[PDB]
Amino acid sequence: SGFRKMAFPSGKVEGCMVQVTCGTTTLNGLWLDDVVYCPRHVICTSEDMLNPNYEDLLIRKSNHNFLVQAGNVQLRVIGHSMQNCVLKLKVDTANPKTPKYKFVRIQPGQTFSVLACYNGSPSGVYQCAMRPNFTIKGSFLNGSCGSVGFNIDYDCVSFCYMHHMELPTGVHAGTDLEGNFYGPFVDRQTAQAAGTDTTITVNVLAWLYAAVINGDRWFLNRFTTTLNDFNLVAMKYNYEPLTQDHVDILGPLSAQTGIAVLDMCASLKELLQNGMNGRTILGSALLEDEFTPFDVVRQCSGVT
Amino acid sequence: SGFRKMAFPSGKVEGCMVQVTCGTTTLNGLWLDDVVYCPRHVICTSEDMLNPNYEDLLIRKSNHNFLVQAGNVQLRVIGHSMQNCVLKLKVDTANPKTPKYKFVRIQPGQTFSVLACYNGSPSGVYQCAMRPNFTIKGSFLNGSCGSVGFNIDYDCVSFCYMHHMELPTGVHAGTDLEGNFYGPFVDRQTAQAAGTDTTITVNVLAWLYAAVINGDRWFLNRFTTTLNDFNLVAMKYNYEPLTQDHVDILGPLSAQTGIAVLDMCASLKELLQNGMNGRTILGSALLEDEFTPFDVVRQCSGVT
Ligand SMILES: Cc1ccncc1NC(=O)CCc1ccccc1F
Ligand SMILES: Cc1ccncc1NC(=O)CCc1ccccc1F
């Protein structure tokens, strides 16, 4: 028992981190097989910041201008190409530490672990959610670009995020591993609107189930609700509308605890309307939405 | 910017995890050089649970009864000994993945990362604090015993915790790597009092500094206090009394932000006396005490 915001073990990803330098800019790259992936903005200088012409900037670069160092050994770059907002540097040596991996585009509301890196060296790991507005609230400083987000399914690493930007609001934006941004963001030093965000309802309900499993039950009540009634409350409080697909994904937690999904919705409705009353749930004084129903099941069953 | 409850990258520790089976019990062991460390209760059966005579239970075991498997390869056990509450199994092969390491006994209030494991396989990593009462609030299920806590200083892993028990209250207890319990706990299936816990004041202040650095400043006020006045409030609210050693450790954060430690104490005093008023600090609706001043500095500067 106990419930923590747990990240996946980062070892398989640590073995893929490299440093990429082009000109005076250094950031992180991900070395998988004989390719190093990194944000294309490694080719920018301070004057280019506002609206870089990446095609023209890249034309001024040759393979030998991309300095790739895997810890302390230098990689030989034999090709370079830009795919969306990422650069792919072909190297002459396959990473001996390449895990089984996939590139996936995650959905908003899904969670993943980030391995924060600086100069190709891992500094820490944390779990987070891709917000409904496609931003992430991470911990990134200058030099962290190229750090990646991922999930692990036993031996397979599914890479889902590569860090590119900090918006002027202090929230973060990045791409899938094909270089496509999540959200409306562009890799330019320009103020950019992140959409209206919402709280991930299905994750809050999953976390209320994790709370009941771990002994925090004070929020359970004598009520029930309907999806329609619950969605009026979700609307008022800027929560994602709950659908039958969400109720279906909560099936295992409802089956394990014996608390019907709509009865848990009535507990969530009461907490939204009345607050916590100075109490806590799993050590939090707010409704947590960074655990998916899969995360709760994995953590509550001991999956490795 | 942004501030997260970040764990150390777990790779160096993942390479040390093994499974240890003795009889019908399986738990995790830590393989460093040619020694595997694990909780001694791996030698218990269900009847022994209440008050095991570990010396007698261990006398019934030979080297060949300890089955140690490093992922999928079997280790040959050539010696066994009990040191306090840990067993040390000498193996004929040094772990090729042994990082530079130290065994340290952490102080209450210090933080560390836990790599939760089941059957010698890592399942997740999270950061936590050793409570002032020597318990930890982790996420551990049956089979997680032998999972370890650690800190990393560039290339050196300082192992500080090995998991042994879940108290009937759902909080966790364990030992240093010499097998000495943190706190008054014994490895028996008996209800055991954890002392009165307190909130780690110096960590809350460190986290208020991390909040100001990251833009959350609404809690700053026009007041100041003294250590004496602050400690009367700390007393009322079950916070650790603040000392000059704590003020000294907060020096770097005070210097960086320009907010004198006693002025931050006056913000903390007001938050204790008035609550958050439905507001948040770094995404939390409570005062967080699981970041030390060193953690804040490391995270806010980008240390790898
Ligand atoms: C400074 C920082 C901090 C944290 N995470 C990320 C960053 N870096 C950025 O936001 C870089 C912004 C940028 C500017 C010019 C061209 C492309 C581009 F993506
Ligand atoms: C069940 C569980 C869950 C999480 N963490 C740990 C555990 N396991 C325990 O508490 C084992 C308790 C014990 C009983 C008999 C002899 C020694 C001993 F330490």
Residue B204 maps to which CATH number?
A: 1.10.1840.10
- Residue B2 sits in the same domain as residue B123: yes
Contacts of B30 (CB under 8 A, 6+ apart): B16, B17, B18, B36, B37, B38, B146, B148, B159, B162, B177
Residue B295 has phi, psi (to 5 degrees) of -60, -40
Q: Do A9 and B124 touch (CB under 8 A)?
A: yes
Which DSSP letter does residue B62 get? -
Q: Are residues B6 and B106 in the same domain?
A: yes
Does residue A210 sit in the same domain as residue A220?
yes
Three-state secondary structure call for residue B13: helix
- Are residues A10 and A106 both part of a single domain? yes
Same domain as A133, residue A171 = yes
Is residue B131 located within the same domain as residue B4?
yes
Residue B99 main-chain phi, psi, to 5 deg? -80, 175
- Give contacts of A2 with chain B, Cβ < 8 Å: 137-140, 166, 170-172
Catalytic residue list contains A300: no
Last residue of a domain, one of B174, B197, B220: B197
Way it was determined:
X-ray
Are residues B253 and B293 in contact, defined by beta-carbon separation less than 8 angstroms? yes
Pick from B167, B197, B227: which residue ends a domain? B197
Per DSSP, which regions of chain A are E strands? 17-22, 25-32, 35-39, 66-70, 73-75, 77-83, 86-91, 100-103, 111-118, 121-129, 148-153, 156-166, 172-175
Which of A197, A215, A250 delimits the end of a domain? A197
State the Cα–Cα distance between residues B254 and B241, nearest whole angstrom: 19
Task: Say whether A6 and B139 touch across the interface (CB within 8 A).
Answer: yes
Please check whether residues A147 and A204 belong to one and the same domain.
Answer: no
User: CB-CB: which of B7, B285, B302 is closest to A126?
Assistant: B7
Pocket test of ligand 1: the residue of A145, A147, A148, A162 to mutate, having most ligand atoms within 8 Å of its CB, is: A145
Helix (H) / strand (E) element for B157: namely strand B156-166
Domain count, chain A: 3
A74 & A222 share domain: no
Nearest bound ligand to the CA of residue A169: 1
State the residue for tokens 């409904």: A132
How many angstroms separate the most distant Cα atoms in chain B? 69
- Same domain? For A47 and A85 the reply is yes
Is residue B12 classed exposed, middle or buried when 0-12, 13-18 and 19+ CB atoms within 10 A define those classes? buried
Which residues lie below 8 Å from residue B169, measured CB to CB, with a gap of 6+?
Answer: B194
B257 C-beta closer than 6 A to ligand 2:
no
Per the document, the length of chain A is: 304
Strand A156-166 versus strand A148-153 pairing type: antiparallel
For testing contact with chain A, the best of B3, B8, B10 (most A CBs within 10 A): B10
Nearest residue (by CA) to ligand 1, atom 2, is A142
Nearest to A14 among B9, B115, B119 (CB): B9
Residue B19: give the domain boundaries. Answer: 15-99
CATH at B113? 2.40.10.10
Instruction: Just list the catalytic residues of B.
Output: 41, 145
> Distance between CA atoms of B164 and B162, rounded to whole angstroms?
7
> What are the angstrom distances between the C-alpha of B14 and each of A9, A16, B70?
8, 15, 11
Is the CB of residue B10 less than 8 Å from the CB of residue B115?
yes
- Ligand 1 centroid to residue A198 C-alpha, Å: 25
Residue B166 to residue A1, Cβ atoms within 8 A? yes
**Of all atoms in ligand 1, which is nearest to the CA of residue A166?**
10
Nearest chain A alpha carbon to B143: A302
Same domain, A106 and A7: yes
With an 8 Å Cβ cutoff, are B14 and A15 in contact?
Answer: no
| Residue A252 Cα to chain centre, angstroms | 24
Q: How many CB pairs under 8 A join A and B?
A: 151
Q: Look up residue B23 and give its two tokens.
A: 């009889």
Ligand 2 lined by B142 (C-beta under 6 Å): yes
Same domain, B242 and B115: no
Task: Provide CB contacts within 8 A for A228, sequence distance 6+.
Answer: none
Resolution in angstrom units: 1.4
Name the token pair of B56.
Answer: 């007698």
**Whether B79 and B165 share a structural domain:** no
B206's CB contacts (< 8 A; 6+ apart) are B250, B253, B291, B292, B293, B295, B296
Q: Which residues of B touch A172 (CB under 8 A)?
A: 2
Q: Contact B205/B239 with Cβ under 8 angstroms?
A: no
Maximum C-alpha span of chain A: 69
